[PDB]
Design an enzyme around this catalytic site. Structure first.
Site, PDB file in Angstrom:
ATOM      1  N   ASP A 119       0.838  -1.191   0.000  1.00 15.65           N
ATOM      2  CA  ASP A 119       0.000   0.000   0.000  1.00 15.65           C
ATOM      3  C   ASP A 119       0.877   1.248   0.000  1.00 15.65           C
ATOM      4  O   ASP A 119       1.709   1.434   0.896  1.00 15.65           O
ATOM      5  CB  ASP A 119      -0.932  -0.028   1.210  1.00 15.65           C
ATOM      6  CG  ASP A 119      -1.918   1.118   1.224  1.00 15.65           C
ATOM      7  OD1 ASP A 119      -1.493   2.279   1.386  1.00 15.65           O
ATOM      8  OD2 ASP A 119      -3.127   0.860   1.064  1.00 15.65           O
ATOM      9  N   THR A 140      -3.633   5.109  -4.013  1.00 16.19           N
ATOM     10  CA  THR A 140      -2.570   5.825  -3.313  1.00 16.19           C
ATOM     11  C   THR A 140      -1.256   5.798  -4.084  1.00 16.19           C
ATOM     12  O   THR A 140      -0.516   6.788  -4.086  1.00 16.19           O
ATOM     13  CB  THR A 140      -2.392   5.248  -1.914  1.00 16.19           C
ATOM     14  OG1 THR A 140      -2.270   3.824  -1.997  1.00 16.19           O
ATOM     15  CG2 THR A 140      -3.593   5.588  -1.064  1.00 16.19           C
ATOM     16  N   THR A 141      -0.936   4.682  -4.736  1.00 16.19           N
ATOM     17  CA  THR A 141       0.274   4.639  -5.548  1.00 16.19           C
ATOM     18  C   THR A 141       0.088   5.415  -6.845  1.00 16.19           C
ATOM     19  O   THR A 141       1.006   6.112  -7.300  1.00 16.19           O
ATOM     20  CB  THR A 141       0.670   3.193  -5.837  1.00 16.19           C
ATOM     21  OG1 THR A 141       0.659   2.439  -4.622  1.00 16.19           O
ATOM     22  CG2 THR A 141       2.044   3.125  -6.460  1.00 16.19           C
ATOM     23  N   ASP A 177      -8.741  -1.618   1.598  1.00 15.76           N
ATOM     24  CA  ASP A 177      -8.850  -1.096   0.240  1.00 15.76           C
ATOM     25  C   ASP A 177     -10.140  -1.568  -0.418  1.00 15.76           C
ATOM     26  O   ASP A 177     -10.917  -0.765  -0.949  1.00 15.76           O
ATOM     27  CB  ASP A 177      -7.647  -1.540  -0.594  1.00 15.76           C
ATOM     28  CG  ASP A 177      -6.387  -0.766  -0.274  1.00 15.76           C
ATOM     29  OD1 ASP A 177      -6.481   0.314   0.334  1.00 15.76           O
ATOM     30  OD2 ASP A 177      -5.294  -1.237  -0.646  1.00 15.76           O
TER      31      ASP A 177
HETATM   32  N1  LIG Z   1      -6.289  -7.436 -13.462  1.00 11.32           N
HETATM   33  C1  LIG Z   1      -5.710  -6.272 -13.829  1.00 11.32           C
HETATM   34  N2  LIG Z   1      -5.137  -6.129 -15.042  1.00 11.32           N
HETATM   35  C2  LIG Z   1      -4.560  -4.979 -15.421  1.00 11.32           C
HETATM   36  N3  LIG Z   1      -4.500  -3.891 -14.641  1.00 11.32           N
HETATM   37  C3  LIG Z   1      -5.035  -3.893 -13.400  1.00 11.32           C
HETATM   38  C4  LIG Z   1      -5.685  -5.112 -12.913  1.00 11.32           C
HETATM   39  N4  LIG Z   1      -6.121  -4.845 -11.671  1.00 11.32           N
HETATM   40  C5  LIG Z   1      -5.781  -3.565 -11.386  1.00 11.32           C
HETATM   41  N5  LIG Z   1      -5.130  -3.004 -12.416  1.00 11.32           N
HETATM   42  C6  LIG Z   1      -4.615  -1.620 -12.463  1.00 11.32           C
HETATM   43  O1  LIG Z   1      -3.590  -1.402 -11.492  1.00 11.32           O
HETATM   44  C7  LIG Z   1      -3.711  -0.078 -10.963  1.00 11.32           C
HETATM   45  C8  LIG Z   1      -3.879  -0.172  -9.459  1.00 11.32           C
HETATM   46  O2  LIG Z   1      -2.838  -0.933  -8.859  1.00 11.32           O
HETATM   47  P1  LIG Z   1      -2.726  -0.849  -7.267  1.00 11.32           P
HETATM   48  O3  LIG Z   1      -1.284  -0.569  -6.944  1.00 11.32           O
HETATM   49  O4  LIG Z   1      -3.428  -2.024  -6.662  1.00 11.32           O
HETATM   50  O5  LIG Z   1      -3.722   0.386  -7.028  1.00 11.32           O
HETATM   51  P2  LIG Z   1      -3.335   1.862  -6.558  1.00 11.32           P
HETATM   52  O6  LIG Z   1      -1.880   1.995  -6.843  1.00 11.32           O
HETATM   53  O7  LIG Z   1      -4.202   2.673  -7.475  1.00 11.32           O
HETATM   54  O8  LIG Z   1      -3.690   1.891  -5.101  1.00 11.32           O
HETATM   55  C9  LIG Z   1      -4.896   0.544 -11.669  1.00 11.32           C
HETATM   56  O9  LIG Z   1      -4.459   1.225 -12.844  1.00 11.32           O
HETATM   57  C10 LIG Z   1      -5.705  -0.658 -12.049  1.00 11.32           C
HETATM   58  O10 LIG Z   1      -6.553  -0.349 -13.150  1.00 11.32           O
HETATM   59 MG   LIG Z   2      -5.550  -0.491  -5.508  1.00 12.40          MG
END
Ligand SMILES: Nc1ncnc2c1ncn2[C@@H]1O[C@H](COP(=O)(O)OP(=O)(O)O)[C@@H](O)[C@H]1O
Ligand SMILES: [Mg+2]
Ligand SMILES: Nc1ncnc2c1ncn2[C@@H]1O[C@H](COP(=O)(O)OP(=O)(O)O)[C@@H](O)[C@H]1O
Ligand SMILES: Nc1ncnc2c1ncn2[C@@H]1O[C@H](COP(=O)(O)OP(=O)(O)O)[C@@H](O)[C@H]1O
Ligand SMILES: [Mg+2]
Ligand SMILES: [Mg+2]
Lengths: 534, 529, 520
Positions: free
Chosen positions: C57, C90-91, C387
């Site tokens: 996270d 958040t990322t 989340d």
């Molecule tokens: N199964 C998947 N295939 C491709 N991209 C994905 C998949 N699941 C999530 N994503 C993409 O990964 C990103 C989010 O990754 P994550 O690090 O979990 O979320 P955040 O960084 O936004 O908290 C978003 O752009 C989301 O659309």
């Molecule tokens: Mg996420």
């Protein structure tokens, strides 16, 4: 951990970012000293020793750099100064920008080999495009071309506004030291123009000496300090009381020989001096010393003797006056003689008082024309910066006279190359294509920096420049637009070929080649092992 | 002969670490240099193109702002003359709320020109005379430079157009939204009487979303939760107590003296029955919400839950007072049920979650009241603090307009007209006072010069254009920041206006600070403890 | 002679200061880049105390990094703000902010006015936000099976980056059941999350009721029974033990008969409280306050269950689940204030004993019980579920879905390139830079996955200009795909708030022209 090396290890994007950071540091040091609106820097040497300068090579030599990827760019500026004499700042800026964009591609995971191939291709094609489209013949342009090239080099220096007069001095000096040798090729051996500094009268009061200027004085105050029909004897041996060499000893067993031996020790040198003076030599320059006993002979003859002259000054005075430097008064007949043919000539030799000091002027030498320049400023800081700037100008004029091609300045060449190479990248691969596009974009750091230093809208100005050059490269009826570059006094593009902003082709060509070599060398690094000293 | 000894007298009797400066060189010029350095530290933040600064104070707290007074407060100003200029700037903040950077810029300019005049050969006395007479002329002139007036402070569009300028220098990108919000709040809390209190505009900064999600609330917001089980109420009958929600005890030491098993068995049941009676009397007055400034007892909370009363605990006394003002209630120091007049009302009282934060909202539905809250959303606490400062600027501008409704053209128009008129006055004034009058005039040029330099254009051409247009007769013309090249336009027709009172007080305070710095001739600093 | 500021004041001013701020932001982004997406990795950070935290996270990672750079603190702050307002992204927010800054770095170095840059950022942000609100998919049916499918898909997407991705269908179903059984406020304090070391992720479970760990029982608790099949539950804030009736209470007697009366009176006070609790019919008794050994043995003899020192949160959850009220007094123990469940039990779960209230049909509460092989394993599981839970809440309140895998970023980058090609030419470059920055999300996905982001971004730019808006990175195939059909769904507000926060942070950082550190 597993690797037991006694040192630190950087690897990958870490060391690549570090290398780019170092190069950027070096380039950001010097970016502010680029173009007619660039400014000079103070450098203090940990003792209060001050150096004023705009010369990037000088700056990077004086700095104490710790990073090897930055030492590379310092050596690049040094090499540009050795091989060209101008471009020492532009080459560093361009190398750093190529490094920046290439590391951006490597971060995007374009392989560094591919970036390097694309950079090499773009360098080759930029050199070709310059040589084919952006050069002007100095024959088609005349002598005002040399004056304009000198003035262009002098812009950004402390002899800028006085360029109108300093450029005339530089051009006259290079044409004076022009000489043709066997193979009948015209050679302009700068570093044979002597440059002396003497704080005092204004810059406009600096002097071009038709002849030679020597940072020396006569050996005795009883000697004359002016001679008109100067017969000059250049000697590479000392005129002193003769001492028997190491493997020779005097061992007396009859006291009656001591007097004659001691007197011979001086009569030998006396005889050599009489032989020299019998030919008509009224001026005698020596790399070695001259004892008081000998200086008295010169005084009584009414001659001008000078001691501890420098070997290079003597070589130049000899070449210029028609004399032969003698290491010995010895001929192929086993005797000791001095011929009047070994003498040189000059219409005057005088000891002139510059400021609180004195020097010697050898004026109107025959068998060749020579040139010296006495720079006159407000203090030693000004005089040293003027010397460096004048060296840059002399090198520039030399290059213009050797290769009779010039290119326009003010970012004209860089804008044209950016356009042409961003169009040319479309043909070569897909990743080398990106590398060539980034090479093109990097080339724009020169007009960008010029405008930034001029305190102008770099974005708008470089966009206008690129628009002009694109129009030139897509409309065959407007090819004269190639000659457009920056006018940094008004923030508006301008025909720099008609404005007189000229650079020797060799400047840009060598800048590109050296910057590419440096960028490739730095980009080839993907690891770093720094061993702990012992 | 290798040491210069201290001269007999004060130089020898001076303490170890103490310093003594005397004369134009050691005292006057060094003070002017310090004030000049200060003005330079804050010059680049002046105007809408003014840039923010990231100040870290000795407590490692971070301030991101282009508010001059805030920057000065968070700086460690140590030179006494600069301290005096900062005192002037803070007095401007206190009197008006906006114009501190004007005070700094103008004072620094007056002092630089005073140093130049002292070098050309005027005496501090003559410089001060001319500066004072020129400040008097500027005050005589400004009323004639007043162009417009508010004409209504109960409207919401006019008030927004009026506050936009003050909230443009700060937060240039988004000023229509902020002027709308601040106008809504100011006219909500504006009473039929001409008196307006700025503490009645509350600001709640909640992390989350962004400045465009901010809103106004006719009521109050508290980053609290409810003590009991009830969380919402739709026809609030609020009862407010400054006392805890517990049984009253003696101020003298109380002791439960038991002497019989019966008393021991009955004491606690009697206590709870007392609590039940108290809370039931409160509930039977109709109160559905109780707000206590002290603590809550478990038994009292039990019975409030039983009788369906929303319990709220406000630790702060200022918060309690402001809630009373909001709802129309009276804080009772006893747990006695409130009379029909001591009770407060709200069209709704509820617990909500704005972002991660839980809040208790006393919300009126009517578009009026004694207190209004601006809930500021934003992605950063620093951003929200800067927007709160901008809100403070807008609210203080509203108060300045309630005091004096007159307005002068901004963007340097009034400053240029002042410079011109005071120069024309100095050209008529004979004697050595004319030099100081003319320099006092030229000091005004520092304002459009700072605006132009920050706009990113050449201040000399901008100032020449302004002088030419004001000679042709247009006093409402000032510089246009929305132009990459030097330009000018009608400040009135553009709606860029300043407060007559703001300019009045800024000029007065800057002149007074400069004149005091000049009146100093000897400085005797003590050893810094 | 006298200095303006205190000796030690560090002032960084100008274009170098701005470029350094951008570089520090790049560092902060690099610190979280590799956590993005299904191929994202976790970070291990350690404190001075030596306690490690393992997280994917970004908000957590940046909270743990002791960032002190004033400009780089802004990325940490906007990641916090994203976790607050949304709970996901958040990322992405940090990556986007740093990429905006990186994209404008050349112009900043070449003297572009920060006001111009911030104007372009604001313009492009408003455009992209309105475009998300425009092309966001909002099924207008309000159907329950499809709205549970929608929430389930958004939760699976929010979980397809964690160490529970191999159980994301499981955990998504549980998260959706959890947020669907909550009340209108969707309070997080109403979802309990217990971490019982030992067991597998699939051994984790949700209890439609409440559950909490056994609480410091006295003697006789083992004499008590441990399963009840229709218990009534007394929830109290009452100390049940022999104690001083009050701390400021002093008994005074002058007779041994009165002495004995007082002793028996204390005992009768306690026994009357206990007898009222017994006569209320409650077979289970929970107190926020201690329940002494005497009361424990009393209830054991009456075959009742008692637990004292129960935490306030578990008590409120038991209340919301069983359907009673918490009583500070035992004098009115009506069936209205008593609670009720179909089954109460005390069972062993991985070394601890847990009380389960299960069978509550009126339950507005649920309790997650998470198993796993480490404290930090279970903590990162909890963070992942947080989340997913926040995602599901936001989706429940606004079922407006876009596609992920960089689909929405590529669509907005295309739209903003189009818009920039229609404006004078200064804002053109800056809005094109905004567009090029938006591509950092699919690029980072491909990077973390081990693909050639260059070819994949070429494919995506091509497919989004040919017609097609939900095409993004396909991770398991190293290719592209219609991610809206692949069900890589993301509530629109996630990316809306991501762009808002990133653009605000970038505008702030670029508006700062001087940094002044005072000495401490
Ligand atoms: N199964 C998947 N295939 C491709 N991209 C994905 C998949 N699941 C999530 N994503 C993409 O990964 C990103 C989010 O990754 P994550 O690090 O979990 O979320 P955040 O960084 O936004 O908290 C978003 O752009 C989301 O659309
Ligand atoms: Mg996420
Ligand atoms: N009059 C001029 N107008 C515009 N550009 C100029 C002018 N004179 C020189 N330049 C440009 O200045 C740049 C660098 O000059 P300078 O810093 O003096 O030497 P170098 O960088 O070659 O060491 C070159 O690109 C040159 O074209
Ligand atoms: N749109 C605008 N155009 C020109 N000038 C403006 C504009 N908005 C505000 N100003 C000017 O900015 C100045 C005030 O800026 P600010 O930094 O807040 O200084 P102060 O702290 O003195 O109020 C005033 O001269 C005002 O006229
Ligand atoms: Mg040069
Ligand atoms: Mg203001």
């Amino acid at each position: 951990g597993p690797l037991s090396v006694f040192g630190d290890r950087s690897t990958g994007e870490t060391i690549r970012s570090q290398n780019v950071m170092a190069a950027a540091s070096i380039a950001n040091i010097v970016k502010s000293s680029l173009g007619p609106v660039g400014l000079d820097k103070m450098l203090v040497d940990d003792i209060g020793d001050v150096t004023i300068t705009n010369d990037g090579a000088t700056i990077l030599k004086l700095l104490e750099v710790e990073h090897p990827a930055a030492k590379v760019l310092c050596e690049l500026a040094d090499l540009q100064d050795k091989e060209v004499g101008d471009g020492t700042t532009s080459v560093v800026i361009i190398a750093a920008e190529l490094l920046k964009n290439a590391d951006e591609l490597v971060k995007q995971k374009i392989h560094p080999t591919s970036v390097i191939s694309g950079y090499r291709l773009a360098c080759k094609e930029a050199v070709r495009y310059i040589n084919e489209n952006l050069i002007v013949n100095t024959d088609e342009l005349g002598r005002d071309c040399l004056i304009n090239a000198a003035k262009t080099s002098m812009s950004s220096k402390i002899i800028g506004i006085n360029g109108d007069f300093f450029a005339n001095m530089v051009v006259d000096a290079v044409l004076a030291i022009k000489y043709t040798d066997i193979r009948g090729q015209p050679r302009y051996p700068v570093n044979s123009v002597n440059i002396l500094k003497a704080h005092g009268r204004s810059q406009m009061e600096s002097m071009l000496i038709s002849g030679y200027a020597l940072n020396c004085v006569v050996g005795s105050q009883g000697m004359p300090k002016r001679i008109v029909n100067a017969k000059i004897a250049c000697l590479d041996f000392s005129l002193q009381k003769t001492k028997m060499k190491l493997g020779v000893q005097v061992v007396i067993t009859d006291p009656e020989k001591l007097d004659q031996i001691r007197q011979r020790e001086s009569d030998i040198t006396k005889e050599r001096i009489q032989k020299i003076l019998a030919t008509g030599a009224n001026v005698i320059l020596t790399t070695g010393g001259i004892d008081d006993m000998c200086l008295k002979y010169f005084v009584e003859a009414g001659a001008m003797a000078v001691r501890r002259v420098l070997k290079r000054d003597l070589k130049r005075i000899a070449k210029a006056s028609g004399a032969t430097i003698l290491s010995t008064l010895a001929n192929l007949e086993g005797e000791e003689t001095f011929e009047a043919a070994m003498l040189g000539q000059a219409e005057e030799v005088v000891q002139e008082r510059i400021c609180d000091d004195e020097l010697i002027l050898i004026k109107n030498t025959k068998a060749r024309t020579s040139a010296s320049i006495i720079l006159r400023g407000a203090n030693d800081f000004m005089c040293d910066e003027m010397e460096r700037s004048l060296h840059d100008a002399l090198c520039v004029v030399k290059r213009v006279l050797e290769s009779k091609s010039v290119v326009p300045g003010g970012g004209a060449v860089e804008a044209a190359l950016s356009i042409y190479l961003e169009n040319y990248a479309t043909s070569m691969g897909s990743r080398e294509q990106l590398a060539i596009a980034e090479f093109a974009r990097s080339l724009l750091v020169i007009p960008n920096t010029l405008a930034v230093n001029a305190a102008q809208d770099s974005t708008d100005l470089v966009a206008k420049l690129r628009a002009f050059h694109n129009e030139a490269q897509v409309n065959p009826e407007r090819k004269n637009l190639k000659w457009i570059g920056l006018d940094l006094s008004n923030g508006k593009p301008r025909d720099n070929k008609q404005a007189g902003v000229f650079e020797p082709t060799i400047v840009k060509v060598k800048s590109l080649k050296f910057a590419t070599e440096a960028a490739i060398t730095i980009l080839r690094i993907d690891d770093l092992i720094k061993l702990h000293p012992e | 002969a290798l040491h210069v000894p201290k001269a007999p007298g004060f130089a020898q009797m001076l303490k170890e670490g103490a310093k003594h400066f005397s004369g134009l060189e050691e005292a006057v010029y060094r003070n002017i240099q310090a004030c000049k350095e200060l003005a330079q530290t804050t010059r680049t933040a002046y105007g809408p193109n003014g840039m923010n600064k990231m100040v870290i104070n000795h407590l490692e707290k971070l301030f991101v702002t282009n508010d001059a007074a805030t920057i000065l407060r968070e700086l460690e100003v140590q030179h006494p003359a600069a301290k005096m200029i900062v005192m002037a700037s803070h007095m401007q903040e206190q009197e008006v709320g906006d114009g501190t950077n004007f005070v700094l810029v103008f004072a620094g300019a007056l002092l630089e020109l005073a140093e130049e005049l002292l070098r050309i050969g005027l005496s501090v006395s003559e410089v001060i005379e001319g500066y004072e007479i020129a400040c008097r002329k500027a005050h005589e002139i400004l009323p004639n430079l007043v162009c417009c007036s508010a004409k209504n402070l109960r409207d919401i569009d006019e008030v927004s157009s009026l506050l936009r300028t003050s909230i443009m220098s700060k937060q240039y990108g988004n000023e229509v939204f902020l002027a709308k919000l601040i106008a809504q709040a100011c006219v909500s809390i504006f009473p039929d009487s001409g008196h307006f209190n700025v503490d009645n505009i509350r600001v709640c900064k909640i992390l989350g979303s962004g400045i465009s999600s901010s809103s106004v609330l006719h009521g109050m917001v508290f980053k609290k939760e409810t003590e009991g089980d009830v969380t919402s109420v739709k026809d609030a009958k609020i009862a407010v107590y400054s006392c805890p929600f517990d049984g009253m005890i003696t101020e003298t030491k109380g002791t439960v003296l038991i002497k019989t098993a019966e008393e021991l068995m009955n004491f606690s049941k009697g206590e709870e029955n007392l609590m039940d009676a108290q809370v039931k009397a409160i509930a039977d007055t109709g109160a559905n919400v109780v707000v206590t400034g002290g603590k809550v007892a478990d038994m009292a909370l039990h019975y409030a839950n039983k009788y369906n009363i929303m319990l709220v605990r406000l630790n702060s006394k200022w918060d309690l007072r402001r809630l009373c003002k909001t709802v129309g209630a009276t804080a009772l120091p006893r747990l006695t049920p409130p009379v029909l007049e001591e009770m407060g009302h709200c069209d709704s009282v509820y617990l909500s979650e704005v972002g991660d934060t839980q809040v208790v909202v006393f919300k009126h539905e009517k578009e009026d009241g004694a207190i209004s809250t601006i809930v500021l959303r934003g992605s950063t606490d620093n951003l929200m603090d800067d927007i709160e400062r901008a809100v403070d600027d807008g609210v203080n501008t509203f108060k300045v307009l309630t005091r004096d409704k007159r307005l002068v053209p901004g963007g340097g128009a009034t400053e240029i007209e002042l410079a011109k008129q005071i120069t024309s006055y100095g050209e008529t004034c004979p004697g050595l006072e004319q030099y100081a009058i003319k320099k006092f005039a030229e000091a005004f040029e520092a304002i459009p010069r700072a605006l132009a330099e920050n706009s990113g254009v050449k201040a000399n051409e901008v100032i020449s254009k302004l002088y030419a247009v004001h000679q042709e007769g247009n006093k409402n013309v000032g510089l246009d920041i929305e132009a990459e090249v030097p330009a000018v336009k009608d400040m009135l027709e553009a709606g860029i206006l300043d407060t007559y009172l703001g300019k009045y007080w800024a000029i007065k305070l800057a002149t007074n600070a400069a004149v005091t710095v000049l009146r100093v001739d000897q400085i005797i600093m003590a050893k810094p403890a | 002679p006298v200095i303006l500021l205190k000796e030690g004041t560090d002032s960084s001013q100008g274009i170098p200061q701005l470029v350094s701020n951008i570089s520090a932001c790049q560092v902060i982004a690099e610190a979280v880049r590799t956590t993005l997406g299904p191929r994202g990795m976790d970070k291990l950070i350690v404190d001075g105390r030596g306690k490690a935290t393992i997280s994917n996270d970004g908000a957590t990672i940046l909270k743990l990094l002791d960032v002190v750079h004033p400009a780089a603190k802004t990325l940490v702050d906007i990641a916090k703000s994203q976790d607050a307002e949304v709970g996901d992204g958040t990322t992405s927010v940090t990556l986007l902010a740093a990429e905006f800054l990186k994209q404008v770095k050349p112009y900043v170095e070449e003297g572009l006015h920060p006001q111009i840059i911030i104007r372009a950022f604001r313009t492009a942000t408003q455009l992209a936000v309105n475009k998300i609100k425009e092309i966001a998919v909002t099924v207008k049916k309000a159907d329950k099976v499809e709205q549970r499918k929608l929430l389930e898909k958004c939760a699976m997407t929010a979980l397809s980056s964690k160490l529970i991705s191999q159980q994301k269908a499981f955990f998504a179903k549980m998260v959706v059941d959890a947020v669907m059984m909550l009340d209108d406020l969707l309070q997080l304090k109403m979802i309990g999350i217990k971490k019982v070391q030992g067991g597998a992720l699939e051994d984790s479970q949700l209890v439609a009721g409440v559950a909490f760990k056994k609480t410091f029982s006295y003697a006789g608790f083992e004499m008590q029974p441990k399963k009840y099949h229709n218990p009534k539950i007394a929830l109290l804030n009452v100390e049940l033990e022999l104690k001083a009736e009050k701390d400021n209470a002093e008994i005074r007697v002058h007779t041994v008969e009165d002495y004995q009366a007082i002793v028996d009176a204390e005992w009768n006070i306690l026994y009357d409280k206990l007898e009222k609790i017994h006569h209320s019919g409650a077979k289970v008794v929970l107190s926020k306050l201690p329940i002494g050994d005497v009361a424990t043995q009393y209830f054991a003899d009456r075959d009742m269950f008692c637990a004292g020192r129960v935490p306030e949160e578990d008590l409120k959850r038991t209340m919301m689940a069983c359907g009673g009220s918490i009583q500070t007094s035992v004098n009115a123990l009506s069936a209205d204030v008593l609670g009720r469940c179909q089954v109460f039990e005390e069972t062993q779960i991985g070394g601890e004993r847990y009380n389960f209230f299960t069978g509550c049909p009126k339950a507005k509460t649920c309790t997650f019980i998470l198993r796993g092989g480490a404290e930090q394993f279970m903590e990162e599981t909890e963070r992942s579920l947080h989340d997913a839970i926040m995602i599901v809440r936001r989706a429940i309140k606004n079922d407006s879905v876009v596609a992920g895998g960089g689909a929405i970023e590529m669509e907005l980058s295309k739209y903003l390139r189009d818009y920039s090609r229609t404006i004078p030419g200064k804002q053109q470059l800056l809005i094109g830079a905004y567009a090029k920055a938006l591509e950092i999300i699919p690029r980072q996905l491909c990077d973390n996955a081990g693909f050639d982001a260059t070819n994949i971004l070429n494919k995506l730019r091509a497919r989004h200009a040919q017609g097609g808006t939900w095409y993004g990175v396909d991770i398991n195939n190293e290719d592209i795909a219609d991610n809206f059909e692949a069900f890589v769904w993301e509530p629109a507000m996630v990316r809306i708030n991501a762009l808002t926060a990133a653009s605000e942070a970038a505008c702030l950082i670029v508006s700062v022209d001087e940094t002044i550190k005072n000495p401490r």
